[PDB]
A = this chain, B = another copy of it.
Amino acid sequence: VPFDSELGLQFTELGPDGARAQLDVRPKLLQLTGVVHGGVYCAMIESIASMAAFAWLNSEGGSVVGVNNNTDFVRSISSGMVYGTAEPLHRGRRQQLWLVTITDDTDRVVARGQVRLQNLEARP
């Protein structure tokens, strides 16, 4: 996934019930006060949820497209690894809703978000 490469996002788990991925906080990922740019977490949340959603749909099949990403920012950090896990809230014919929670290396939540996706049909 191109943008994931820029983030340094690396997946550790991926399947129909969820996904997990991680990245190292680096200086290029910060904002002006030297803490993580919120966009990084929004992006992490989007990636992890979308990959889980695709895995589930294809476990008739098809593709997925994001329609809403709603992220709450909890705690400001400046370095170390962050870790996200996606868990399912709704998985149906038309849409899916996934929760992604990002923690730091002290198991404190730094961000948490929900991603709503549309399922798109495949050619039969």
Interface 9-mer from A41-49, A83-91, A101-109: A41-49
Q: Which of A1, A29, A31, A72 gathers the greatest number of chain B CB atoms within 10 Å?
A: A31
Closest Cβ of chain B to A119, distance in Å, is: 14
Most chain-B Cβ atoms within 10 A of its Cβ — which of A3, A39, A46, A63?
A: A39
Contact between A43 and B33, CB atoms less than 8 A apart: no
A31 in contact with B1 given A39-B39, A42-B39 (CB within 8 Å)? yes
Tell yes or no: A71 within 8 A of B by CB: yes
> Given the complex, which residues of B lie within 8 Å of A42, measured CB to CB?
39, 42-43, 46, 69, 71
Per the 8 Å Cβ criterion, residues 4-28 of A in contact with B are 4-7, 27-28
Q: Do A68 and B71 contact each other (CB < 8 Å), given the known contacts A31-B2, A31-B3?
A: yes
Q: Does any Cβ of B come within 8 Å of A122's Cβ?
A: no
Beta-carbon contacts under 8 Å, A92-114 to B: none
- Indicate whether A65 reaches chain B with its CB closer than 8 angstroms: yes
The docked-state distance in angstroms from the alpha carbon of A27 to that of B3 is 8
